[PDB]
Amino acid sequence: MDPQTLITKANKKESWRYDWYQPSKEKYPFRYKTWLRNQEDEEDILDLKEFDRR
Amino acid sequence: LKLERKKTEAVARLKSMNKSAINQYNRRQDKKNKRLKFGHRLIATHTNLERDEQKRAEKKAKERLQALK
Amino acid sequence: TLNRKCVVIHNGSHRTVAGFSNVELPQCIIPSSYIKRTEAEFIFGTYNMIDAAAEKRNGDEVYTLVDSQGLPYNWDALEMQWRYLYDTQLKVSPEELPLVITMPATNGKPDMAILERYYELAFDKLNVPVFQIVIEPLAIALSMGKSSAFVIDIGASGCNVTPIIDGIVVKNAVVRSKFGGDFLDFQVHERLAPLIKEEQKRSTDVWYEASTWIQQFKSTMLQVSEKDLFELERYYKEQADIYAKQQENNPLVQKKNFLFKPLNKTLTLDLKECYQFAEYLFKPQLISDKFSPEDGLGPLMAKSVKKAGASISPEQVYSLLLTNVIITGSTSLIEGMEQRIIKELSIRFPQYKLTTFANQVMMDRKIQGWLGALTMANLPSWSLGKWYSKEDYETLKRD
Amino acid sequence: PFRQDSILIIYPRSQTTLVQFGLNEETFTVPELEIPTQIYRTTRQDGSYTYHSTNKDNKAELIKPIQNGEIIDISAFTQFLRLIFVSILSDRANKNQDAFEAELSNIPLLLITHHSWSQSDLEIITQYVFESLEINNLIQLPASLAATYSMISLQNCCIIDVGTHHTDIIPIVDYAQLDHLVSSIPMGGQSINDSLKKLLPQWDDDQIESLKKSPIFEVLSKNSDLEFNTFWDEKGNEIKVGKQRFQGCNNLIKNISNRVGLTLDNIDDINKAKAVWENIIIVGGTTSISGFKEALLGQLLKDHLIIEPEEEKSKREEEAKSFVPTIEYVQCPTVIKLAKYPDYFPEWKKSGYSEIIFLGAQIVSKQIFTHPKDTFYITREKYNMKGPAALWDVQF
């Protein structure tokens, strides 16, 4: 089956990005990278057995 | 006024730093304890895995030694 | 807490400690020195240098980064070290994360010039987003839940005595002894010299020996006697006579054995000779006739407290300081040290009750400076420390 | 939570990656899945990358993501995990078809990490596991700790992990990896190969590799009785060999030992130090060479043991001819030992313990995942709150 759909059907929800952030006290003059949470709006298969040992 | 301010401001800076420092120290000790505790449990887990194996092997040898083939 | 992760760097005069603010121990402790091997080339790191040092190759020379002030004095080399740390140890662009670094307590003068060299390094060269500078004695004290404390730091460069009252550092009462760890290395070497055959430019061997057998010897042989040693001796003698005379054991005659590896040879010292090394920190008049008893650690501590009492009652500051004595530093771990620092303080200030504090965990004092900076970096508010931004630099640059 | 059928352990290394899905419950089995650590990267005009299991029409390049244990290509590495993970899903989803309600419904992942991986790499991997693979529970277990937990859970020890091109030396004190002491030397199994090439010029690489992997190659410290012995080529060709079969391991053994010494000498609490020296753990393929571990121990003793120099001792015994008390030294180590292996994992005993780090992970994962407390892994709850940074609140 489609790998992406296999991933989708198993194990059953936010997303983070690593980006510039500018803290505030309004805003401090500096930046720094951190893991920010995103807002509302932000191939193949191998056959085991070849790799099984025998 | 601008003083009563500054002073309470300063007193609170110190009060809050002291708080963070004490909390951080207690967090160290906690991590260190939960770690040592997990380790010391695995020793016990090992002991039980070892006892279980010994029982298993013993039942195996006991049949093996009194029966052919 | 805050959504950030800082790089925490501590450049001591002897060791450099680096790691991230999100974990309890540093990623690396490396030497605050380097080999320049010769087309030039710069070796950093404890094993890299000890390997290169053992190669015993001409042209190889060890240079230092931090002077005896505890302040960086070779800024081209310091950048190479920082690059090395960020590239090979933390493995992160220096441009991403806030930086927290340390300075030693000063009287105030060298401060502005240093701050500028840091701007140039942090901004012009590395492109760090923003950095804080914490004052070592201050951070160590804070990391220990103390706002006011008499911080006695015995490191490689010497003893650094720093009174800190209600979160503020009393600069005129800041005092830096000249005798510490490195001094002890010199004496261990000079004294043991004839048993090990041995008796700048020869920096490489001096360094390698200091970093290998000499370091082990200090950690295993030296002890600090609790009471003035000359007095301990007269007493133990005076007592020993009586046990002897009485019928018809002096503790200083106990022997201690150290396996010296480079010659597979045992070195034996009696306990007195073991006590002798650290005695110099307290009574340096015993090496040269050029040192006054006042350069010794005991008089020095006293001097600094009394200079604290001159603010800007004294028998109050005295009382505050002496109920919050912090003993810290790699060398302060030598057996007997806390007790002698205490005895030495207690007799210069009999009217007062001393209460001292110290990390009892071996590792944690060696890097307590870095541990201090770490607990600053984990403070819950951006307003708790001065954070220099590229701005600050721009504005200083104007006239 | 959680099904034992469902526990997934992945142990990626420079050449291959050991994998297991489901724990046996009776006894622990040696991992049966061994997948070469590489992925193909086709480049699609417009810049982007695509990743496949095979050179697609000879259009893709071959990426080897982990080298000398270090991740050198974090994107190909995450693509490689997905490739493994997907494959496992497909495999199970065919065989049983109700799998998405049972075996595939809640898959906790234990990923064995290497000391050299960035925090940045560890966060990105965490993001990948929660966001791309849509997994919900993750332990990142350091290789060193897996080691000590397999070894009957040692609070203080040293791991010597001998790879192909490098050997890691990793002290553990109070169940914590001592990062600032950790190091690797650029030297491993190949060194043996190289030593041997110098000693046997007229041989070639496959001949030399065959000797190393043969029953008659050992480190000495009955085969040892024979001047010559025999072994067979990869291609069945019989080869005879003299004293060279007891050589080639020395330069490596000395290098590791010198490093171990400088390392343990920088443990500040001598009481910890004594304990570490008494629990030396040696792991890795090379170590299965007959005699190797004992030879390495032998060298650590020869170089580092604190004990009276023989001449000195011989004088004292002559002097007493006219009983000799033991000289006590202030230093450690006065005792050096290899840590004791557990003999009660039958399958593991059968196959040797070169890969025992994996048994470490089988044990940890069963412990952690078959008990309520979520103290040692990242959960969705946690991921939703702190994101990849969640990782640092469950470090050991």
Swiss-Prot record, chain A:
Record localization? Nucleus
Coiled coil start-end: none
Q: What remark does the entry add? A: Present with 1550 molecules/cell in log phase SD medium.
This chain's function reads:
Probable component of the chromatin structure-remodeling complex (RSC) which is involved in transcription regulation and nucleosome positioning. RSC is responsible for the transfer of a histone octamer from a nucleosome core particle to naked DNA. The reaction requires ATP and involves an activated RSC-nucleosome intermediate. Remodeling reaction also involves DNA translocation, DNA twist and conformational change.
| Subunit details | Interacts with STH1 and SWI3. Component of the two forms of the RSC complex composed of at least either RSC1 or RSC2, and ARP7, ARP9, LDB7, NPL6, RSC3, RSC30, RSC4, RSC58, RSC6, RSC8, RSC9, SFH1, STH1, HTL1 and probably RTT102. The complexes interact with histone and histone variant components of centromeric chromatin. Probable additional component of the SWI/SNF global transcription activator complex.
What is the protein name for this chain?
Regulator of Ty1 transposition protein 102
Q: Which organism is it from?
A: Saccharomyces cerevisiae (strain ATCC 204508 / S288c)
Residue span relative to the full protein: 1 to 90 of 157
UniProtKB/Swiss-Prot annotation, chain B:
Could you list the residue ranges that cross the membrane?
Answer: none
Subcellular location per UniProt equals: Nucleus
Going by the entry's taxonomy, the superkingdom of the source organism is recorded as Eukaryota
Chain ranges of the HSA domain = 1-69
The protein's job, in short, is: Involved in transcriptional activation. Catalytic component of the SWI/SNF complex, an ATP-dependent chromatin-remodeling complex, which is required for the positive and negative regulation of gene expression of a large number of genes. It changes chromatin structure by altering DNA-histone contacts within a nucleosome, leading eventually to a change in nucleosome position, thus facilitating or repressing binding of gene-specific transcription factors.
Note from the entry: Present with 217 molecules/cell in log phase SD medium.
Q: How does it assemble?
A: Component of the SWI/SNF global transcription activator complex. The 1.14 MDa SWI/SNF complex is composed of 11 different subunits: one copy each of SWI1, SNF2/SWI2, SNF5, SNF12/SWP73, ARP7/SWP61, ARP9/SWP59; two copies each of SWI3, SNF6, SNF11, SWP82; and three copies of TAF14/SWP29.
Protein name listed in UniProt: Transcription regulatory protein SNF2
Q: Which organism is it from?
A: Saccharomyces cerevisiae (strain ATCC 204508 / S288c)
| Complete-protein stretch covered | 592 to 660 of 1703
Swiss-Prot record, chain C:
List the Gene3D superfamilies: 3.30.420.40, Actin, Chain A, domain 4
The protein's superkingdom reads: Eukaryota
Q: Describe the effect of residue 18 to P.
A: Impaired heterodimerization with ARP9. Temperature-sensitive phenotype. Moderate suppressor of Ty phenotype
Compartments it resides in: Nucleus
| Assigned keywords, A-Z | Chromatin regulator, Nucleus, Transcription, Transcription regulation
Cellular component, GO annotation: chromatin; NuA4 histone acetyltransferase complex; nucleus; RSC-type complex; SWI/SNF complex
State the Gene Ontology terms under molecular function: chromatin binding; structural molecule activity
Family annotation (Pfam families)? Actin
Chain segments annotated as transmembrane: none
Q: GO:BP terms for this protein?
A: chromatin organization; chromatin remodeling; nucleosome disassembly; positive regulation of transcription by RNA polymerase II; regulation of DNA-templated transcription; regulation of transcription by RNA polymerase II; transcription elongation by RNA polymerase II
Q: What does this protein do?
A: Component of the chromatin structure remodeling complex (RSC), which is involved in transcription regulation and nucleosome positioning. RSC is responsible for the transfer of a histone octamer from a nucleosome core particle to naked DNA. The reaction requires ATP and involves an activated RSC-nucleosome intermediate. Remodeling reaction also involves DNA translocation, DNA twist and conformational change.
Q: What else is known?
A: Present with 1360 molecules/cell in log phase SD medium.
Record's family? Answer: Belongs to the actin family.
Can you name this protein?
A: Actin-related protein 7
Native organism taxonomy: Eukaryota, Fungi, Dikarya, Ascomycota, Saccharomycotina
Curated annotation (Swiss-Prot), chain D:
User: What keywords sit in the KW lines?
Assistant: Chromatin regulator, Nucleus, Transcription, Transcription regulation
Any single biological process term in GO: chromatin remodeling
Kindly list the places in or outside the cell where this protein is found, as annotated in its UniProt entry.
Answer: Nucleus
Is this entry keyworded Nucleus? yes
Q: Which domain of life is it from?
A: Eukaryota
The record gives the effect of mutating residue 285 to L as:
Impaired heterodimerization with ARP7
- Keyword Plastid attached: no
Gene Ontology cellular-component terms for this entry are: chromatin; nucleus; RSC-type complex; SWI/SNF complex
Which Gene3D superfamilies does the record associate with it? 3.30.420.40, 3.90.640.60
Molecular function as annotated in GO? structural molecule activity
Q: What is its main location?
A: nucleus
The record's section on Pfam families has:
Actin
| Entry-linked InterPro entries | Actin, ATPase_NBD
* Stored PANTHER family: ACTIN
Outline the subunit composition: Forms a heterodimer with ARP7. Interacts with LDB7 and NPL6. Component of the two forms of the RSC complex composed of at least either RSC1 or RSC2, and ARP7, ARP9, LDB7, NPL6, RSC3, RSC30, RSC4, RSC58, RSC6, RSC8, RSC9, SFH1, STH1, HTL1 and probably RTT102. The complexes interact with histone and histone variant components of centromeric chromatin. Component of the SWI/SNF global transcription activator complex.
A further note on this protein reads:
Present with 1790 molecules/cell in log phase SD medium.
Family listed: Belongs to the actin family.
Q: What does this protein do?
A: Component of the chromatin structure remodeling complex (RSC), which is involved in transcription regulation and nucleosome positioning. RSC is responsible for the transfer of a histone octamer from a nucleosome core particle to naked DNA. The reaction requires ATP and involves an activated RSC-nucleosome intermediate. Remodeling reaction also involves DNA translocation, DNA twist and conformational change.
Q: What is this protein called?
A: Actin-like protein ARP9
Gene name, per UniProt, is: ARP9
